[PDB]
Amino acid sequence: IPKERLRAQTNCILLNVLKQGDNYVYGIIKQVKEASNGEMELNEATLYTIFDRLEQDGIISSYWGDESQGGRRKYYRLTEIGHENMRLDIESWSRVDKIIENLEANKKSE
Amino acid sequence: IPKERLRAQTNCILLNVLKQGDNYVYGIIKQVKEASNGEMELNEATLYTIFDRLEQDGIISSYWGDESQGGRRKYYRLTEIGHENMRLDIESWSRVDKIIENLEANKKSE
């Protein structure tokens, strides 16, 4: 319950980083540290566990980057399904919020 | 994934009904039908499955109502833990949204 809340919120934050453009682990981790004012310092193990599921479910794809450094670097991209699922999320959840303000309003009536 | 999104959103809507005051199945189902403009017509089986978990985890409590009708009627109440968990949710998720607008802003910088 305290770990389940986080799981969703981490996943949400990570996918929004990939919304800003394709990225690789440390690029993501440093961006998250920055935008969360140091609160959320992500682990590589955590990020890869989450990314390994997301890739399986077709929400993100991985590809090899430019190797003009003399080394491998895995980039991550938000797929088509993942863009769509991200849109439906905002659609569903704003609808929910309309349904809730209607229940707070049906109180005022009754 | 399409069923997991709903599970969370149903749970959220149901707990907000119990925010408006203690209630019993059909009172809840009719209120949800109303505030969702007929879209969400809940099943008793569904509602009770969800409520049986929520009660186990201590988020809601059940009690017997007034029996001046000559019949049993189970009411449901949002517990202390459940009020707190509902507050933390809004706390965490608005923070998340700050973290996201910061990632959409760190783009504009870079």
Radius of gyration of chain B (CA): 18
* Cβ contact A11:A60 at 8 Å: no
Does residue A92 form part of some domain? no
Residues of chain B with C-beta less than 8 angstroms from the C-beta of A94: none
SS3 assignment, position A99: helix
CA A78, CA A23: separation in Å to the nearest integer?
10
Distance, CA of A88 to CA of A78 (rounded, Å): 15
Token representation of residue A4: 């389940």
Which of B17, B15, B20 is CA-nearest to residue B84? B15
Question: A41, A84, A99, A104: which to substitute to probe chain B, counting the most B Cβ within 10 Å?
Answer: A99
Closest in A96, A106, A107 to B9, CB measured: A96
Of the CA atoms within 13 Å of residue B26, those in its CB half-sphere come to: 1
Whether residue A42 lies inside any domain: the answer is yes
Residue A32 with chain B: CB contacts under 8 Å: 99
- Please tell me the distance in Å from B66's CA to the nearest CA on chain A: 20
Q: How many domains are contained in chain B?
A: 1
Considering Cα of A2, then A32, then A13, then B19, what sign does the dihedral take?
positive
Chain A hits for B85, Cβ within 8 Å:
1
For residue A101, being part of any structural domain is answered with no
Is B65 part of a structural domain of the chain?
Answer: yes
Is A88 within 8 Å of A66 (Cβ atoms)? no
DSSP-derived secondary structure for A22-88: -B-HHHHHHHHHHHTTTS----HHHHHHHHHHHHHTTSEEEEE---TTSS--EEEEE-HHHHHHHHH
What is the extent of the structural domain holding A34? Answer: 2-78
| Shortest alpha-carbon distance between residue A92 and chain B (Å) | 8
- Residue A27 exposed, middle or buried by CB count within 10 Å (0-12, 13-18, 19+): middle
Which residues pair with residue B77 across a beta bridge?
A: B61
Which two three-digit tokens encode residue A39? Answer: 């609160």
In chain A, residues with a C-beta closer than 8 Å to the C-beta of B12 are: 96, 100
Which has the closest alpha carbon to A73: A19, A32, A22, A31? A22
10 Å Cβ neighbour count for A90? 9
In a domain, B91, yes or no: no
Is A100 a member of any domain?
no
* Closest residue to B31, CB basis, from A5, A57, A106: A106
- Taking residue B99's Cβ as centre, other Cβ atoms within 10 Å add up to 21
Give exposure, B59-90, as e/b (b: 16+ Cβ within 10 Å): bbbeeeeeeeeeeeeebbebbeebeebbeeee
User: Residue length, chain B?
Assistant: 110
Helix, strand, or coil (residue B97)? helix
Residue in the structure block whose two tokens are 């809940």: B42
> End-to-end alpha-carbon separation of chain B, Å?
34
CB A102 to CB B34 under 8 A? yes
* Residue A105 within any structural domain of the chain: no
Residue B39 is encoded by which pair of tokens?
Answer: 């879209």
- What CATH number does residue B45 fall under? 1.10.10.10
What lies within 8 Å, CB to CB, of A29 at 6+ separation is: A41, A42, A44, A47
Q: Is residue A84 part of a domain?
A: no
CA dihedral (B88, B91, B96, B97) in degrees, to 10, reads: 140
Tokens 């907000």 locate to: B16
In the block, which residue shows the tokens 């992500």? A42
d(CA B3, CA B88): 24
| CA nearest to B57, candidates B9, B11, B6, B5 | B11
Inter-chain touch A36–B99, beta carbons under 8 Å: yes
